[PDB]
Amino acid sequence: NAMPLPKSLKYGDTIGIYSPSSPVTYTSPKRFERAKSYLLQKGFHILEGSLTGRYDYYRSGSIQERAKELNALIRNPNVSCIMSTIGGMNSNSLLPYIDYDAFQNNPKIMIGYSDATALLLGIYAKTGIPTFYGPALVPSFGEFEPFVDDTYKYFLETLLHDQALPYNIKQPLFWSDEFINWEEKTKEKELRPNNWISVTNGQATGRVIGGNLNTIQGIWGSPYMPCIQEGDILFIEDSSKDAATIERSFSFLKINGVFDKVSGIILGKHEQFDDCGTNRKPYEILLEVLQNQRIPLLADFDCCHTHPMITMPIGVQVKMDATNKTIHILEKWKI
Amino acid sequence: MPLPKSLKYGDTIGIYSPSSPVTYTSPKRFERAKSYLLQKGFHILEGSLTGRYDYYRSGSIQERAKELNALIRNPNVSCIMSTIGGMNSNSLLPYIDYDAFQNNPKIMIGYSDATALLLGIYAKTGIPTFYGPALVPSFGEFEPFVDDTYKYFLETLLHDQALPYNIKQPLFWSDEFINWEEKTKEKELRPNNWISVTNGQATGRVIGGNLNTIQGIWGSPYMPCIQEGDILFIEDSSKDAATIERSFSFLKINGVFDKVSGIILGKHEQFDDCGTNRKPYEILLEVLQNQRIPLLADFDCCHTHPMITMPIGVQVKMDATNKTIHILEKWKI
């Protein structure tokens, strides 16, 4: 059923940036100026949100200031794509104040990751328009060559180019999560050979829903969290956490019946994971929480904090094959 | 609403470690805690994971559940007390023997991460549980503060108390991050007050505990539903401004503040204000957006010393403007 979608990105389009949380545009000026320059050189225009350059310690501004910033982008018909500068923690503060009506009356590509999950999922829940787990300006497009160019490839392939369906999501050949080269480059990140992991064999087809699991706990139960439906594919990712923290998040899903409903799980890589001396991988901890319940599971998916990043539409039908390690998007996410 | 028997001198406290393996990593504080209580006249029965170690946790999901279940089903045990928190009590929730607890109610006590179990048993059984002392942090503390925490623990659980039961504020507190295993100096006596953040009175059933933890059980059958007129009791410890903003807004977008008649906010041990110089209550006031909810803050039922033993799931009367809290409903036999 033809069910409304944002317009594809085009060359020359204006991308609106906003800072719903951490004031990265103040604290990391070089990476920010670099990220801008990367996309401008590709041919896009950037429209700097009203909190760009601003500093309120752990945030860019008050809840009202940050809502006002995003709403001004949302109301702007000249903006085609709205992208967070970075995450943090405090995106969920904005949810009561977003102009959802405005967004529904002029759908745009909404993209970001990490803490922006609150907003991605909030907008999708209120408006039904799919949104995108993908690049945030500073971390993603501020990355030095070579990785930036793959992230950019995926960003273009999914939001600008036309794609016949089923659309296959190709595994990046290389990845990294090295904690270097933030503001200044000091050596080439290692180009590590990449793979996804077939943790539990099987196939599932269903609507993909998820994002950053830690952020989800900040919106769970509210009108801004979509209800997980029978047959959904759960997409989850965390970054720079430890084993205690993720066990809690996994058990949180378990005690909420999420794993009774989902047909399959896609787990992103865990940037800089701290296993607390256990040597356990995040999927092993999840598997203990799953207990005797068998669910097709594909891990170390490259849609998270690690580089490169894939752009994943949320709220659309996907097919995951955990045994052969494939993901295809089965329904249109843009027009 | 059935109720547990009051503690008595001579009873046995059963201890368990639903998360962090503190009896392994902190043997001196542990021993000291157990000796303090033995001296008072209680026995300690030591959970089957006592002394075990699995890095960030005491043991597997199944083993921790079995450890608590053995205590719940032991008729010789009057009080079940966590050794410490951590992060992972919520993992046990599917495996706990709620029906045995219900058929033989007893005192369930602890704080921090143990909120997952305090609320889950209450959600499942309707039996009141208690936000209060965990063995190692609470009773392994040195003088002077451990004796005030013990005074409160008797007042709620052992003493025969008339209704309404008045919960008094201590003279002095501390949150100094020293004297864990061994003493080195004395902690600073910080002079106390509770904070009339937003004036008013409210009477209603008290629900909450450690807010960070609550986000690990929210929306599940183990989280009691917040009803119209409930008093929200929330506490966080050793977090930062960003973290508690998220949790406050999490309550807001879930409609909690449309329903509760009052709030009671704990002190925030070693709070990190990220340079803002803002108090947690001020962050909460921003999130509240001028909604008029009576708000009493810096309540001493949290990670700071000393700690009050507060019942959960019972009628409470709070007066934020005159800084009083009374328990209005019987919580033990």
Side-chain angles (χ1 to χ4, degrees):
Chain A
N1 252 41
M3 58 93 169
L5 288 170
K7 280 194 218 175
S8 300
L9 197 62
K10 314 184 300 292
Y11 298 108
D13 270 4
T14 300
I15 298 183
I17 66 180
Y18 71 104
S19 303
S21 203
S22 300
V24 72
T25 72
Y26 180 90
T27 45
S28 292
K30 286 159 177 191
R31 188 165 185 115
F32 169 47
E33 289 304 323
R34 184 163 69 242
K36 265 154 63 189
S37 284
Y38 189 80
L39 288 179
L40 293 182
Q41 192 278 344
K42 294 300 188 192
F44 302 94
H45 186 31
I46 299 200
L47 178 53
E48 292 184 325
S50 58
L51 298 177
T52 306
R54 312 287 313 294
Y55 184 62
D56 189 40
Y57 305 100
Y58 73 96
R59 58 194 192 174
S60 58
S62 70
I63 299 180
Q64 289 311 123
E65 282 170 321
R66 285 173 285 142
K68 266 181 173 60
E69 201 184 22
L70 180 56
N71 283 157
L73 296 185
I74 287 176
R75 292 152 179 173
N76 191 343
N78 303 130
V79 179
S80 303
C81 166
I82 290 170
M83 169 191 297
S84 49
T85 52
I86 197 163
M89 226 151 45
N90 301 295
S91 287
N92 65 339
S93 291
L94 314 209
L95 291 161
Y97 313 110
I98 296 180
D99 194 344
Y100 301 102
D101 283 338
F103 186 88
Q104 212 158 359
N105 296 329
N106 284 305
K108 319 186 153 76
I109 303 159
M110 187 76 173
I111 189 155
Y113 76 107
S114 172
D115 182 62
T117 298
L119 299 187
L120 294 168
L121 290 176
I123 277 169
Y124 165 69
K126 288 281 279 175
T127 72
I129 295 149
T131 58
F132 300 90
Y133 204 71
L137 174 76
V138 183
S140 305
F141 287 124
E143 179 64 9
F144 290 102
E145 293 195 324
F147 284 110
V148 67
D149 296 309
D150 285 314
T151 297
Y152 181 73
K153 174 160 62 47
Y154 307 136
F155 170 89
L156 270 221
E157 275 164 354
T158 303
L159 310 174
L160 187 131
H161 287 135
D162 309 313
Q163 301 288 352
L165 304 177
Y167 168 58
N168 182 46
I169 303 282
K170 291 175 158 173
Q171 293 197 317
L173 299 182
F174 313 103
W175 76 287
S176 182
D177 74 337
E178 286 174 63
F179 190 68
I180 63 178
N181 303 348
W182 186 248
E183 285 278 89
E184 346 241 354
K185 187 133 156 136
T186 65
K187 88 156 181 91
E188 296 299 308
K189 293 183 188 173
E190 202 191 354
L191 301 168
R192 298 177 196 145
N194 188 34
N195 282 106
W196 295 344
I197 295 154
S198 165
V199 178
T200 298
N201 285 166
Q203 288 91 28
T205 298
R207 182 185 62 160
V208 58
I209 289 267
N212 177 270
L213 183 45
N214 206 281
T215 304
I216 275 164
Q217 289 170 83
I219 59 168
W220 188 263
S222 76
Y224 308 99
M225 176 75 202
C227 294
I228 302 304
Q229 284 151 24
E230 258 315 321
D232 290 343
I233 290 165
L234 180 60
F235 160 61
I236 43 165
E237 177 270 312
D238 277 311
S239 303
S240 297
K241 299 316 196 297
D242 63 0
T245 300
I246 57 161
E247 187 182 328
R248 186 176 71 172
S249 297
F250 296 149
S251 285
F252 146 86
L253 289 171
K254 167 63 159 156
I255 64 181
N256 270 286
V258 174
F259 300 139
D260 294 325
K261 282 189 234 290
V262 295
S263 50
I265 299 160
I266 303 171
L267 182 69
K269 285 180 174 74
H270 199 126
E271 182 204 41
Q272 291 298 325
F273 173 65
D274 178 355
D275 64 44
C276 307
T278 68
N279 283 122
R280 296 183 185 132
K281 308 161 150 64
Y283 74 79
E284 291 171 329
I285 299 168
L286 178 52
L287 268 54
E288 189 194 356
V289 171
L290 296 179
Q291 295 280 124
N292 51 350
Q293 180 182 213
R294 182 180 192 283
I295 306 169
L297 183 33
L298 183 59
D300 273 10
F301 186 60
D302 300 277
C303 193
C304 62
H305 263 105
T306 63
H307 299 280
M309 201 185 187
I310 291 162
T311 300
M312 187 71 183
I314 299 302
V316 307
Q317 212 69 26
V318 168
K319 183 165 75 65
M320 68 163 289
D321 186 345
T323 86
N324 299 303
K325 315 195 259 177
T326 67
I327 303 300
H328 297 67
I329 317 294
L330 302 176
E331 108 201 285
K332 291 178 92 284
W333 54 92
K334 62 177 198 192
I335 51 148
Chain B
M1 160 177 3
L3 311 173
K5 288 184 166 54
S6 303
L7 195 54
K8 293 198 298 319
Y9 293 107
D11 290 4
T12 294
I13 298 166
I15 67 175
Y16 70 109
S17 297
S19 196
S20 300
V22 70
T23 62
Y24 180 83
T25 56
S26 269
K28 293 190 189 200
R29 195 167 176 111
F30 173 41
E31 284 307 320
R32 187 162 66 247
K34 291 191 285 176
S35 296
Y36 188 90
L37 291 177
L38 286 205
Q39 271 173 66
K40 295 298 182 187
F42 302 99
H43 301 112
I44 301 281
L45 173 68
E46 304 194 340
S48 65
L49 295 165
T50 294
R52 287 256 237 107
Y53 184 74
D54 188 37
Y55 301 91
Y56 71 97
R57 63 184 188 176
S58 64
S60 54
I61 297 177
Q62 291 285 156
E63 288 168 280
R64 284 174 285 142
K66 293 182 182 208
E67 176 188 44
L68 178 57
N69 284 338
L71 301 172
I72 290 174
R73 299 153 181 169
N74 183 339
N76 301 137
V77 169
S78 290
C79 171
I80 296 160
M81 186 194 48
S82 53
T83 53
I84 194 153
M87 288 248 253
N88 301 296
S89 299
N90 70 327
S91 283
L92 328 206
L93 284 163
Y95 313 101
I96 293 173
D97 196 343
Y98 301 103
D99 287 353
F101 181 87
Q102 205 165 336
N103 305 343
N104 207 84
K106 42 208 188 222
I107 290 154
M108 193 68 176
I109 189 157
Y111 73 104
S112 188
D113 185 66
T115 300
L117 299 186
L118 295 171
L119 293 182
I121 283 151
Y122 175 77
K124 290 297 257 198
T125 67
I127 304 171
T129 64
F130 297 92
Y131 205 74
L135 178 67
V136 175
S138 310
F139 291 122
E141 181 69 11
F142 288 98
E143 286 98 320
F145 287 118
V146 60
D147 298 311
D148 285 319
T149 290
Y150 178 73
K151 273 155 71 178
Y152 282 128
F153 171 89
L154 289 182
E155 279 198 292
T156 301
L157 306 180
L158 183 136
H159 286 152
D160 192 21
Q161 291 292 358
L163 289 190
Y165 164 45
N166 188 17
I167 302 270
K168 292 171 171 193
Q169 90 162 251
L171 296 177
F172 292 111
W173 67 280
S174 170
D175 70 344
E176 256 188 86
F177 193 82
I178 57 187
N179 298 355
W180 186 247
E181 281 289 74
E182 349 211 277
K183 188 140 164 176
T184 72
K185 80 221 236 311
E186 307 293 310
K187 299 191 177 165
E188 195 171 38
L189 296 169
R190 313 278 289 292
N192 196 16
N193 281 118
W194 290 345
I195 305 180
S196 290
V197 173
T198 306
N199 289 141
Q201 296 72 30
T203 290
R205 171 190 72 156
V206 67
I207 303 273
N210 188 84
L211 182 47
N212 212 260
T213 302
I214 276 166
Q215 291 171 72
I217 60 160
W218 188 257
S220 84
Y222 308 101
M223 175 68 205
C225 296
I226 294 285
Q227 307 176 315
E228 276 294 334
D230 284 346
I231 293 182
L232 181 71
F233 162 52
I234 40 163
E235 171 287 279
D236 276 308
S237 309
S238 308
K239 300 300 192 304
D240 72 344
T243 297
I244 62 162
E245 186 186 322
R246 188 166 74 176
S247 307
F248 293 147
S249 287
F250 149 87
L251 297 166
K252 165 78 181 183
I253 70 191
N254 268 287
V256 172
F257 301 128
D258 295 315
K259 297 183 210 216
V260 300
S261 58
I263 304 171
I264 163 55
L265 184 64
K267 286 194 176 73
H268 198 115
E269 187 210 29
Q270 294 288 337
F271 176 57
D272 184 346
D273 71 0
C274 310
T276 58
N277 262 124
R278 293 164 196 167
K279 302 178 189 78
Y281 72 82
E282 289 173 332
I283 298 192
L284 174 51
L285 271 44
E286 183 188 2
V287 172
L288 291 163
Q289 279 276 108
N290 302 129
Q291 210 190 121
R292 186 57 2 86
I293 309 188
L295 184 48
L296 179 62
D298 283 355
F299 190 56
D300 301 283
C301 190
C302 67
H303 263 96
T304 57
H305 303 272
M307 194 189 185
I308 291 182
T309 297
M310 177 79 174
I312 299 322
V314 296
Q315 293 302 127
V316 172
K317 152 57 166 333
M318 69 172 272
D319 172 345
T321 146
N322 303 295
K323 306 170 178 70
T324 63
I325 289 158
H326 287 80
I327 314 294
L328 304 186
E329 173 184 3
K330 222 196 187 280
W331 59 92
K332 56 194 187 56
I333 310 156

